[PDB]
């Protein structure tokens, strides 16, 4: 089985901005790869990408009911749509759980959180640290949840203390975690 | 506060493929399944809150198929070229021995979006407590997935994610094991 | 709450 | 306790040149954006759309009947300043979803106009 | 002009095969058959989106649907009873316009003994 395969993509996208108060709809056609034709909010009307989308920016164009739910998108779809599951999507918050570990290399583990927005601190004596301090980014694990690992390249002496700190739209007041000698 | 919904959709010929899901900051609100005309939540919890008709989305996958036909011939028969994937194997969590974790294999920038994934435990298939997911969309218009694998870390144990791909020469492996 | 199918259009 | 429209319940008789009004209140369960609409059906005639309204705030009109989509009541109802003679006939409110096939219809209201 | 149906009136009797016609010159995707009792209003029997395939509406107990192209969509009545006379509507819609209905003339079908 060699048989040559044909891909149809169909994006309907709501991209909003300090909350609904701004809202953009984009309704996106796609062949393959190649974005072919697209209806814009802002624009009003379908307008073809390539060359293979011009027929179908002019016959779209021509169905006048068509045009107004599409021009009507930003409230009867995009704005509906964010509301009904603003309690379990926009709301939602998931504590992380932080989880120190030596790898001359300390690891700060942040797990199971939501949403992204989140930042991740070393300290070494009460002072935070800014040389050695590699992160693996935002890590999304496919189910609601991110994780985010963060290395400190440190020499460990005897006394010393390092303190992780995660800070989280979740939380009211930072989490810490300590690894002494 | 920046938000992106997506509805995406998408039609595969010959294999007679259709999708059709719900996207919000990369994660998947909801799919239906094709074959039992059902919405299926990704968390159990959204079905609480919400519902949806999804005879709405057989319906966008019916005009989807006859557009694609159109559009197959408008193109003079131009196939997709294959895109191999990226794999990479992580947890979700730091392991320790004998405490519950999931292995965790990442398939991403592939199209076009069939896949064969195995978890393999010393070379052998496993499927206890396997899961995975549809096809996700990506901004460039590619493809990614997750599979998961609920296991107990040990010394003696390896694991490898089979993935295979029209793009790829021979199966891709990605090796796991304890530290 | 109920989500609202945004319909594809149809060409031709 | 699902999806339903609630009309002005039988006949409504209204003399020429009279204002009109025919109540329409809707309660859906599994619609989910419902766009509004008013059809007449003309007597030996079939039904045909009179109006509609895609957004809720904001109203249709058409040979001189009016009707405003008001969604903070879940209210579409039809008005008319001055009755004519050809406007007897039995008036249909209805909702849709227009990304599926669901239509929810009103029982109907007959408009008899007399002298 | 768009959607036409027929017969536009029918007398038949109680165990009787009657089947109603519809054609749309539209090239809608959905059609529809409804019917219209006085106190109930107008209710959905049988629908269609897509050709070749039909869906049970709300009240299907008595009717059978068939759609063999993309044109027509006919309702046939296998064995008529009484509780069926009344004034049925075809119907059609696509996105192209929005899915606003489009109605035929209507089929008034009296059933005697």
């Known amino acids: 089985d060699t048989r040559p395969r044909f891909l149809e993509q169909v994006k309907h996208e709501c991209h909003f901005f300090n909350g609904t108060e701004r809202v953009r709809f984009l309704d996106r056609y796609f062949y393959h790869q190649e974005e072919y034709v697209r209806f814009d909010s802002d624009v009003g009307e379908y307008r073809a990408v390539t060359e293979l989308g011009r027929p179908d920016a002019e016959y779209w164009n021509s169905q006048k009911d068509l045009l107004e739910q599409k021009r009507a998108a930003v409230d009867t779809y995009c704005r509906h749509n964010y509301g009904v599951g603003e309690s379990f999507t926009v709301q939602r918050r998931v504590y992380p759980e932080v989880t120190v570990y030596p790898a001359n290399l300390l690891v700060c583990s942040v797990n199971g959180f939501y949403p992204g927005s989140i930042e991740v601190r070393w300290f070494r004596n009460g002072q935070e640290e800014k040389t050695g301090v590699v992160s693996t980014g935002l890590i999304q694990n496919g189910d609601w949840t991110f994780q985010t690992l963060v290395m400190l390249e440190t020499v460990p002496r005897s006394g010393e203390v390092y303190t992780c700190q995660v800070e989280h739209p979740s939380l009211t007041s930072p989490l810490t975690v300590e690894w002494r000698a | 506060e920046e938000h992106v919904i997506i509805q995406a959709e998408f039609y595969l010929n010959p294999d007679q493929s259709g999708e059709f899901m719900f996207d919000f900051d990369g994660d998947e609100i909801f799919h239906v399944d094709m074959a039992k005309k059902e919405t299926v939540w990704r968390l159990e919890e959204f079905g609480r809150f919400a519902s949806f008709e999804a005879q709405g989305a057989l319906a966008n996958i019916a005009v989807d198929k006859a557009n694609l036909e159109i559009m197959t011939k408008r193109s003079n028969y131009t196939p997709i070229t294959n895109v191999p994937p990226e794999v990479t194997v992580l947890t979700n969590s730091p392991v320790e021995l004998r405490e519950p974790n999931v292995l965790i294999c990442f398939i991403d920038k592939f199209t076009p979006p069939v896949v064969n994934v195995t978890w393999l435990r010393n070379g052998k298939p496993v499927t206890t407590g396997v899961s995975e997911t549809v096809f996700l969309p990506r901004e460039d218009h590619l493809f990614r997935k997750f599979h998961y694998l609920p296991f107990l870390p040990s010394t003696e144990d390896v694991y490898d994610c089979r993935v295979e791909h029209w793009g790829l020469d021979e199966p891709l492996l990605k090796h796991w094991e304890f530290d | 709450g109920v989500y609202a199918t945004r319909s594809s259009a149809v060409r031709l | 306790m699902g999806d339903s429209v609630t009309q002005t319940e039988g006949q409504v008789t209204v003399s020429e040149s009279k204002s009109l009004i025919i109540n329409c209140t809707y309660s859906?369960?599994?619609?989910?954006?419902?766009?509004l609409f008013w059809y007449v059906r003309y007597p030996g005639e079939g039904l045909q759309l009179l109006l509609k309204?895609?957004?809720?705030?904001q109203k249709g009109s058409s040979r001189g009947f009016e009707a405003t989509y008001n969604k903070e009541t879940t209210s579409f109802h039809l008005q008319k300043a001055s009755v004519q003679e050809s406007d007897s006939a039995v008036y249909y409110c209805?909702?849709?979803?227009?990304?599926?096939?669901?239509?929810?219809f009103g029982a109907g209201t007959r408009l008899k106009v007399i002298a | 002009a768009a959607v036409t149906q027929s017969p536009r009136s029918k007398v038949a009797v109680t165990g009787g095969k009657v089947t109603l016609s519809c054609h749309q010159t539209?090239?809608?995707?959905?059609m529809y058959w409804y019917r219209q009792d006085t106190g109930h209003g107008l209710r959905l029997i049988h629908y269609?989106?897509?050709?070749?395939?039909?869906e049970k509406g709300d009240i299907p107990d008595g009717y059978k649907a068939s759609r063999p192209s993309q044109e027509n969509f006919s309702l046939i009545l296998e064995l008529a009873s009484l509780s069926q006379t009344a004034v049925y509507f075809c119907?059609?819609?696509?996105?192209?316009?929005?899915?606003?209905?489009?109605f035929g003339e209507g089929s008034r079908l009296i059933v005697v003994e």
């Open positions: 269609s989106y897509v050709a070749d395939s039909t």
């Open positions: 539209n090239n809608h995707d959905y």
């Open positions: 859906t369960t599994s619609i989910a954006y419902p766009n």
């Open positions: 209805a909702l849709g979803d227009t990304g599926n096939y669901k239509y929810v």
């Open positions: 309204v895609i957004t809720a705030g």
């Open positions: 119907a059609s819609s696509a996105v192209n316009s929005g899915n606003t209905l489009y």
